[PDB]
RNA sequence: CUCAACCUGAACUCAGUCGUGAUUACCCGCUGAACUUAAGCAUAUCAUUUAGCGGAGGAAAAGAAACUAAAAAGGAUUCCCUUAGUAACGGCGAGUGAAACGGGAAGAGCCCAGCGCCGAAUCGAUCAGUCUUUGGCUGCUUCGAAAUGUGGCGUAUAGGUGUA
RNA sequence: CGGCACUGUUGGUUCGCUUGCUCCUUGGAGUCGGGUUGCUUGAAAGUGCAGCCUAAAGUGGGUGAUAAACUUCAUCUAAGGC
RNA sequence: GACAUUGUGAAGAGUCAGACUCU
């Protein structure tokens, strides 16, 4: 912290040259990436008319027997990465219990 | 078969390096090229500078170069919003525009804002038809004062300035500096450890 | 618009109704010849997006490639060499199939010139694309300012010359350190730089 | 190619567009769409002089003109034809209209829509 | 079964175009050795190089960040000096080996798809006028391309409506 | 023969442009990513390229040079073009 | 040998809780 003898440090948490911060507002280019209202109409609409992939209902009746541990390994091995596949395996749990409120 | 006390070889000239061979007769034909490619410019392009667009003032990105300034590619749009000047208008008066560049602090964009009004002080602006000025045209004795500026637009300067002497306080002399920066040190890399501490602490 | 429904739908590739398009298209496309004009665009949304156009002088071509590995052309996999070159099999070629299908039509239409092209389909023999071409002579390409570009005496032959987007992606380009290889536009003019000699006026 | 289209399994969402419209519905939606044909060649030819010396209602087409209609939801009738290929071009509409609640029908002839809008398909 | 559409595919010494083959100094994409060095030799080196194939221009290619970085930050591409024989690779042997920051030459920005609005407002031949006719401008000329969508606005710096 | 600057004249063309406020809006798939194989690089638990298998998402995706989870952030916007 | 090309039905056995695996 400035001060007598200090007028900033070259290191430690605290470390800088003293400055004023502008507010900070999100660039333009920093917008790519959330959906429109329109694009999710359009991929709930693709789901239902296409439908789901054998790995997908694979791990549908995985879900449904509750062996989420082998269904988030078979979604590692399938689609790759632990990040994808535990958003893979959030989606897919989604669909089950939209299913079984619908049915049951 | 090196023998005594030598430097171990080094050179790589085991590729048929005469293949790709580069000789530099030519720099003297070169500068004479360039400085007559810079004459055809000012003469295409008189009155204006033959530098070309203006660029803005930055600072070197690492710490090691922090404390020096330089020019930029050109001036931000937050730059040309406080200095009053559109885009569009930039680009037709001869200002460089750097559409990448953001302002995340007020001095540096302050500098170039003040570059900006000093351009613009300069600045002498020709009427579109020579018959008819409008609004924000130079005056006619303005315009005959007109002359082509050859080298860095609005060049930088690079002298150091010594601080003016001073008196030594006793809350300056009785700081612990080493202290003090052992400290800060200590403190970062020790961060992390005592904040798992204190979350062990919490939940016992 | 129906583009994003087209575009969406594409993208499922695995579901029942593309698979059952899917194997009629390959069946249909593997009984006709390599390289085949078609009258129109399999996927407009695709061909739009790479930069087709509805309008006289845009061309589109099936181009069918072999899949697999190059095998090196030696006899009996004789190599005459060290271990380091007895390799015969696993070698794979240094441009993607859909790089060699573009220079197949292009090789092909000597009088037009490749745009872009798209993947339309594939069995384990064979991967079909469909190359969007433009004739550079016709009116309709020589008066609109927008695809003057294309007809230009620099373009000849983008595809043998590696600058379509798929011909590029072998290149190796792009920015930072993970692309330094191929500063100043290629890797063997980068190459040249490093490795020439240099002989200051000076010195 | 008809003999294996024939023999495979059709999904549901591709074996829709096999079942039109009857032949008497169809004739119906024939004769009511023809009220409202484009404007003709020769209607525009008479029509371009006649404006030089100085909108009704029309049939809508072309699948993103009908998207956005439908997800609008202006468009009170829409028909498909059962035969655009590739199949992705439509493949979307019936669901769409569904959804929308605006009625829709899968009509047999491209060809047939197109000469009721002076058109080729 | 008659006639009429579309779709797909043909034949034309049909009307008018276009490509082929050369050149090697530089440029772009592939393919790709061994001699040699390691005092032997196989990884390594020679070398991502001779040789072979293809493709352009007066320059080519690259090019307007899915970048550098971690400052109080820089800001397309190309090229020079320096970084530097450095980080790094290597039977960690022989050997190989960059880049950013920094100083300079030159510096110029932009267009689509998609979303949305207008929705065929767009375009090629042919005919007839007209001119400064190895090409241009006008059309109730006649055909055709185009709704499986040509054109206008518009692209991350966003953009658009209304309003001052 | 070219280039310029100014005058005349022929043809075409201009409801635009900037800043404030208001409301609405905003994007590339057999692609990315992953496994394995081969080549390549100074790139070292993979720098670049490609074959086969697998195969996405939407504040998502990529990157931050030692691999993995859980965390602070920073920085861009790939798979289209001049 | 595995994966893909690879689709449509039956019978048996085994896993589960209508599916999968095999022959």
Same mark, same amino acid.
């Not at chain 2, 002298?159 to 200590?186: C, H, M, S």
């Not at chain 3, 079909?128 to 309709?140: C, G, Q, S, T």
């Given at each position: 912290?400035?001060?007598?003898?200090?007028?900033?440090?070259?290191?430690?948490?605290?470390?800088?040259?003293?400055?004023?911060?502008?507010?900070?507002?999100? !660039?333009?280019?920093?917008?790519?990436?959330?959906?429109?209202?329109?694009?999710?109409?359009?991929?709930?609409?693709?789901?239902?008319?296409?439908?789901?992939?054998?790995?997908?209902? !694979?791990?549908?009746?995985? +879900?449904?027997?509750?062996?989420?541990?082998?269904? +988030?390994?078979?979604?590692? !091995?399938?689609?790759?990465?632990?990040?994808?596949?535990?958003?893979?395996?959030?989606? +897919?749990?989604?669909?089950?219990?939209?299913?079984?409120?619908?049915?049951? | 078969?090196?023998?005594?006390?030598?430097?171990? $070889?080094?050179? =790589?000239?085991?590729?048929?390096? =005469?293949?790709?061979?580069?000789?530099?007769?030519?720099?003297?034909?070169?500068?004479?090229?360039?400085?007559?490619?810079?004459? #055809?410019?000012?003469?295409?392009?008189?009155?204006?500078?033959?530098? $070309?667009?203006?660029?803005?003032?930055?600072?070197?990105?690492?710490?090691?170069?922090?404390?020096?300034?330089?020019? $930029?590619?050109?001036?931000?749009?937050?730059?040309?919003?406080?200095?009053?000047?559109?885009?569009?208008?930039?680009?037709?008066?001869?200002? #460089? %525009?750097?559409?990448?560049?953001?302002?995340?602090?007020?001095?540096?964009?302050?500098?170039?804002?003040?570059?900006?009004?000093?351009?613009?002080?300069?600045?002498?602006?020709?009427?579109?038809?020579?018959?008819?000025?409008?609004?924000?045209?130079?005056?006619?004795?303005?315009?005959?004062?007109?002359?082509?500026?050859?080298?860095? %637009?609005?060049?930088?300067? =690079?002298?150091?300035?010594?601080?003016?002497?001073?008196?030594?306080?006793?809350?300056?002399?009785?700081?612990?500096?080493?202290?003090?920066?052992?400290?800060?040190?200590?403190?970062?890399?020790?961060?992390?450890?005592?904040?798992?501490?204190?979350?062990?602490?919490?939940?016992? | 618009?129906?583009?994003?429904?087209?575009?969406?739908?594409?993208?499922?590739?695995?579901?029942?109704?593309?698979?059952?398009?899917?194997?009629?298209?390959?069946?249909?496309?593997?009984?006709?010849?390599?390289?085949?004009?078609?009258?129109?665009?399999?996927?407009?949304?695709?061909?739009?997006?790479?930069?087709?156009?509805?309008?006289?002088?845009?061309?589109?071509?099936?181009?069918?490639?072999?899949?697999?590995?190059?095998?090196?052309?030696?006899?009996?996999?004789?190599?005459?060499?060290?271990?380091?070159?007895?390799?015969?099999?696993?070698?794979?070629?240094?441009?993607?199939?859909?790089?060699?299908?573009?220079?197949?039509?292009?090789?092909?239409?000597?009088?037009?010139?490749?745009?872009?092209?798209?993947?339309?389909?594939?069995?384990?023999?064979?991967?079909?694309?469909?190359?969007?071409?433009?004739?550079?002579?016709?009116?309709?390409?020589?008066?609109?300012?927008?695809?003057?570009?294309?007809?230009?005496?620099?373009?000849?032959?983008?595809?043998?010359?590696?600058?379509?987007?798929?011909?590029?992606?072998?290149?190796?380009?792009?920015?930072?350190?993970?692309?330094?290889?191929?500063?100043?536009?290629?890797?063997?003019?980068?190459?040249?730089?490093?490795?020439?000699?240099?002989?200051?006026?000076?010195? | 190619?008809?003999?294996?289209?024939?023999?495979?399994? &059709?999904?549901?969402?591709?074996?829709?567009?096999?079942?039109?419209?009857?032949?008497?519905? @169809?004739?119906?939606?024939?004769?009511?769409?023809?009220?409202?044909?484009?404007?003709?060649?020769?209607?525009?030819?008479?029509?371009?002089?006649?404006?030089?010396?100085?909108?009704?209602?029309?049939?809508?087409?072309? &699948?993103?003109?009908?998207?956005?209609?439908?997800?609008?939801?202006?468009?009170?009738?829409?028909?498909?034809?059962?035969?655009?290929?590739?199949?992705?071009?439509?493949?979307?509409?019936?669901?769409?209209?569904?959804?929308?609640?605006?009625?829709? @029908?899968?009509?047999?002839?491209? @060809?047939?829509?197109?000469?009721?809008?002076?058109?080729?398909?």
């Amino acid at each position: 912290m400035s001060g007598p003898g200090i007028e900033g440090l070259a290191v430690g948490l605290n470390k800088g040259h003293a400055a004023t911060q502008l507010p900070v507002k999100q !660039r333009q280019n920093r917008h790519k990436g959330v959906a429109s209202k329109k694009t999710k109409i359009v991929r709930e609409l693709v789901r239902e008319i296409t439908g789901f992939a054998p790995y997908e209902r !694979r791990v549908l009746e995985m +879900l449904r027997i509750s062996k989420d541990k082998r269904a +988030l390994k078979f979604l590692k !091995r399938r689609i790759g990465t632990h990040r994808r596949a535990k958003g893979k395996r959030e989606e +897919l749990q989604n669909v089950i219990i939209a299913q079984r409120k619908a049915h049951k | 078969a090196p023998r005594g006390n030598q430097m171990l $070889g080094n050179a =790589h000239f085991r590729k048929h390096w =005469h293949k790709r061979i580069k000789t530099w007769f030519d720099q003297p034909a070169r500068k004479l090229r360039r400085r007559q490619n810079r004459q #055809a410019k000012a003469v295409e392009i008189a009155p204006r500078p033959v530098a $070309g667009l203006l660029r803005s003032v930055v600072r070197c990105p690492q710490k090691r170069y922090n404390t020096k300034t330089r020019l $930029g590619r050109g001036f931000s749009l937050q730059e040309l919003k406080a200095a009053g000047i559109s885009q569009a208008q930039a680009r037709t008066i001869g200002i #460089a %525009v750097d559409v990448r560049r953001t302002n995340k602090t007020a001095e540096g964009l302050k500098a170039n804002a003040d570059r900006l009004k000093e351009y613009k002080a300069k600045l002498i602006l020709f009427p579109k038809k020579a018959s008819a000025p409008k609004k924000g045209d130079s005056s006619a004795e303005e315009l005959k004062v007109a002359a082509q500026l050859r080298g860095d %637009v609005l060049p930088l300067s =690079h002298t150091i300035t010594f601080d003016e002497p001073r008196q030594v306080t006793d809350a300056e002399r009785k700081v612990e500096i080493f202290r003090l920066l052992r400290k800060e040190r200590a403190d970062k890399k020790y961060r992390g450890k005592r904040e798992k501490r204190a979350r062990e602490a919490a939940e016992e | 618009g129906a583009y994003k429904y087209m575009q969406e739908i594409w993208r499922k590739k695995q579901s029942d109704a593309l698979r059952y398009l899917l194997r009629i298209r390959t069946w249909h496309y593997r009984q006709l010849s390599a390289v085949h004009r078609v009258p129109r665009p399999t996927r407009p949304e695709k061909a739009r997006r790479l930069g087709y156009r509805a309008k006289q002088g845009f061309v589109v071509y099936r181009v069918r490639v072999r899949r697999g590995n190059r095998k090196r052309p030696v006899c009996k996999g004789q190599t005459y060499g060290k271990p380091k070159t007895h390799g015969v099999n696993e070698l794979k070629n240094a441009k993607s199939k859909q790089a060699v299908a573009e220079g197949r039509a292009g090789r092909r239409l000597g009088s037009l010139r490749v745009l872009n092209s798209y993947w339309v389909a594939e069995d384990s023999t064979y991967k079909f694309y469909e190359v969007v071409l433009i004739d550079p002579f016709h009116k309709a390409i020589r008066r609109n300012p927008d695809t003057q570009w294309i007809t230009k005496p620099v373009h000849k032959h983008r595809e043998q010359r590696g600058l379509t987007s798929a011909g590029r992606k072998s290149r190796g380009l792009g920015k930072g350190w993970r692309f330094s290889a191929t500063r100043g536009g290629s890797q063997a003019k980068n190459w040249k730089r490093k490795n020439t000699k240099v002989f200051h006026r000076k010195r | 190619s008809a003999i294996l289209q024939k023999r495979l399994k &059709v999904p549901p969402t591709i074996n829709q567009f096999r079942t039109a419209l009857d032949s008497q519905s @169809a004739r119906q939606a024939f004769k009511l769409l023809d009220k409202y044909r484009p404007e003709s060649t020769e209607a525009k030819k008479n029509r371009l002089r006649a404006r030089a010396e100085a909108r009704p209602n029309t049939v809508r087409h072309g &699948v993103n003109t009908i998207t956005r209609l439908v997800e609008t939801r202006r468009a009170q009738l829409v028909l498909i034809a059962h035969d655009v290929n590739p199949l992705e071009i439509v493949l979307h509409l019936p669901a769409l209209c569904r959804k929308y609640n605006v009625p829709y @029908a899968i009509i047999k002839g491209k @060809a047939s829509l197109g000469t009721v809008v002076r058109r080729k398909t």
